[PDB]
């Protein structure tokens, strides 16, 4: 079927791309980077992240695959030596697909803007103090003061979420996790401190107290939004689909990345 | 139908119990503490915990209710002033039921012993050093050295799990969370550090490295087990059933307990 | 002697200032905000912080006093009701002085710039990834990757240092404490994680690995420095001098601010 | 002069001991394990710890040296290959001595008992809940509820203190650090959470609220004390003296143990 391949841009990732394309030339596979059904990422998890956001409007028609030319990644989790076996099983098809949950972020102004995140979305101040009221399912939960907040996907829990003390969630759990950044807790300002894991259909909204300008990141895209009235987090109805050609368990992927390999 | 009421044992909880029983006497309600369908706990979350383990072999035939004579609890979450309205709606029936996940703990010896936990199960050393190999789904994940480990239910995340840095999970998520106690991480011993959230059907097993004696707790029951070969954690197939007479959201219950009320 | 008074600028702090000045008019006290020997801060700890940096070149000739028109502060630690008793004991003199350690920050370019910090100095990235080599006493200690680093004074440990997990140090200890911000620790990048407390004459230097641009803060002053070659931290030879008119222990000040008052 | 050598008891540590003794036989050195002036520990930090407590009543007449037959230790910080160069410089004398601060622990009953700690002293419950009032310099600081408390020496900060989130202090700082174990913080029970670093002459006392029985550890000695009325912590007037034959900085020792070697 139709396929395309992105590359980190360095020498080793470009040459591995040209080899798979040539290998794909020996099968009924059409290269099409406009309406592809297979998207192969060669490089790292960041290269995978860019491939995800390049085709985030066609998520239900694509099965992603990641190849890591460097260290092992949680998304680019196949060694370059498996490329020739990869193009082989990709051309036959009949493979199985695995789906991971995504995070929807809505930004309301004085107008709206929606985004999808494969890892996490963070909110910080535009320079001054960061103060937001945290509203869970329309119930005011807390007034947060500190550096910022981070809402992570399940598979995103191994990224920025881990550095903030968040838990690692298996990606089969449809949920989202909220962690704090350098919260100030004293006699008069109190946060929950613990990370919070929210299930599907739970809406977490951040509302400004004074400053209405926040530096909002979604994966590696960080944009200063101005005159913000609300930031809404919830598990997305959309899922990212992976092509599965063998068994590489998430917990094993966690072990290899943080314990030793 | 059949019902029973447990009490913390102090004066205020005993008198509230006798009042509900007398109120129940005005309805078609038979007091039966052998095969009850309604179990009312009056006191605190600990009183609720004892009521749970008193009838853990009849979990599918019972809807639990907790009344807090002291501070608000996550299980005993109804004020004593709601007792007369409680006995009223309990007698009519037609109420809705809410189910929370439970944790199964299996202990293997040189023989087996199984337990159910409403909050958490912890493992510690019998005095010496605590060292276990952590095996997730038959894959060796890590060798843990430290004070001990804690596997928490979703609703149990607000108890001991919270004190160890674990996240707070909404109890509609069928999962279990593993946290570390004072892990030693250096050049040669490394743990994941982050809490781990496991979905249904994921089996986490602890295996001894040297000492085969561990102090194992299950909720408030702590027993020294000897000649242990394995400790297996997994989400239980059984669930605890609550009677729901109005709306008291979990996140609201979290706010009232840790932010302010 | 010579004195001056700064104010937060709001109504209550301005009027308390005019009252103390009028009270000072009944004594041999000359108002001089150019070469003062007494500097009174009325407002909050931030107002005190501005008063410190306004006269940081005359630190050895000044005894500072802070009055809090709002909540209790660690520097502005005297209630407005003590103002008339304050001006009284300040005019007589013969009071005792207390000294707190300060932090010296040196920035080297491709040129040098030095600063003094009463609370802390932080280093972060100019947008991209923050990576620095940490060199303690000319010995390379670690390569830090994460959000940033914070070096705190003893009295500054109750501010940003506390939010990052740092310890609270009694200000009679001449030392400085370094804490991490959202460090990434995996198989290939490892930080110490624990906060580090350095004594006098220990030099901690940060050196760039790739990006030479860092957003450096010193108390509430945050400046983007460009083409940076080194950042040097060490306990300053200078100390801030407080006027002591009664006993308000630091640990008591910690209790009142974080436990309850 | 007079000297003695302790050994871990395994084969490699025993043989290295007999070699140094034979090497000492070529010098004016008398083996005396009753009134030694040199105490050499061969094994690990635990072997060093036992050597410290074996001669804790003669601390001012002894210069300790540690040799690690296994991994590098913070006290046993000299490789076995340096033994022949060690016995050489030890016999000549004229070496320099380095002193580290120690922690004094006093236990009051309904009678008193005092102890010295090279690493730390911990207090925990005898099975039930651990609740103590924390009194700093006769001022009630907090009511602690949780697993227990740990007061660490400067050099002890790299041991149990590190696992609890405490900071690493350079041992030239005469101070002690208090850390919390799994504290419960909610609406009604609040602890400081942050570790606390106390200077010389600051007295930290723990007082029972209900249970008067506590499991108290001092380094590796753990004893159940009964009918306890008070536990007093303070920096000891005594110091441990090390023989210094070259330069092995503490921060370098920290790097080798936790970063990589
Ligand atoms: C892009 C990315 N996604 C990640 C993830 N889900 N878990 C761990 N690491 C990750 N990275 C590398 C930058 O943090
Ligand atoms: C018995 C109990 N269960 C709890 C829970 N699930 N969350 C918070 N607190 C709890 N308690 C009180 C003792 O910790
Ligand atoms: C200006 C300031 N200094 C502080 C300090 N040393 N400890 C706690 N709080 C402090 N504040 C208030 C802003 O954090
Ligand atoms: C006996 C000992 N003392 C230590 C110390 N001061 N720092 C790190 N590790 C240490 N050990 C080994 C057991 O934790």
Short mmCIF file of N, CA and C and ligand atoms in Angstrom, two decimals, chain D residues 45-46 49 74-75 119 155-156 158-159 220, ligand 4:
data_model
loop_
_atom_site.label_atom_id
_atom_site.label_comp_id
_atom_site.label_asym_id
_atom_site.label_seq_id
_atom_site.Cartn_x
_atom_site.Cartn_y
_atom_site.Cartn_z
N UNK D 45 32.42 -0.16 54.38
CA UNK D 45 32.02 0.87 55.33
C UNK D 45 31.39 0.27 56.58
N UNK D 46 30.68 -0.86 56.43
CA UNK D 46 30.14 -1.53 57.59
C UNK D 46 31.23 -2.05 58.51
N UNK D 49 32.37 0.89 60.29
CA UNK D 49 31.39 1.27 61.31
C UNK D 49 31.58 0.46 62.58
N UNK D 74 32.73 5.26 51.53
CA UNK D 74 32.98 6.62 51.99
C UNK D 74 33.93 6.66 53.18
N UNK D 75 34.03 5.58 53.95
CA UNK D 75 34.99 5.48 55.04
C UNK D 75 36.16 4.57 54.67
N UNK D 119 26.98 7.52 61.37
CA UNK D 119 26.12 7.79 60.22
C UNK D 119 24.83 8.49 60.65
N UNK D 155 28.84 13.21 57.24
CA UNK D 155 29.30 12.07 56.46
C UNK D 155 28.24 10.98 56.33
N UNK D 156 27.28 10.94 57.25
CA UNK D 156 26.18 10.00 57.14
C UNK D 156 25.11 10.38 56.14
N UNK D 158 25.25 10.50 53.03
CA UNK D 158 25.31 9.65 51.85
C UNK D 158 24.72 8.26 52.08
N UNK D 159 24.27 7.96 53.30
CA UNK D 159 23.69 6.65 53.60
C UNK D 159 22.17 6.70 53.60
N UNK D 220 24.23 0.67 62.79
CA UNK D 220 23.64 -0.63 62.50
C UNK D 220 23.11 -1.33 63.75
C1 LIG E 4 28.07 1.78 56.45
C2 LIG E 4 27.86 2.90 55.43
N1 LIG E 4 28.10 4.18 55.67
C3 LIG E 4 27.80 4.84 54.56
C4 LIG E 4 27.86 6.19 54.22
N2 LIG E 4 28.26 7.08 55.11
N3 LIG E 4 27.49 6.57 52.99
C5 LIG E 4 27.08 5.67 52.10
N4 LIG E 4 27.02 4.38 52.39
C6 LIG E 4 27.37 3.92 53.61
N5 LIG E 4 27.44 2.73 54.19
C7 LIG E 4 27.06 1.42 53.61
C8 LIG E 4 25.63 1.03 54.05
O1 LIG E 4 24.65 2.00 53.63
#
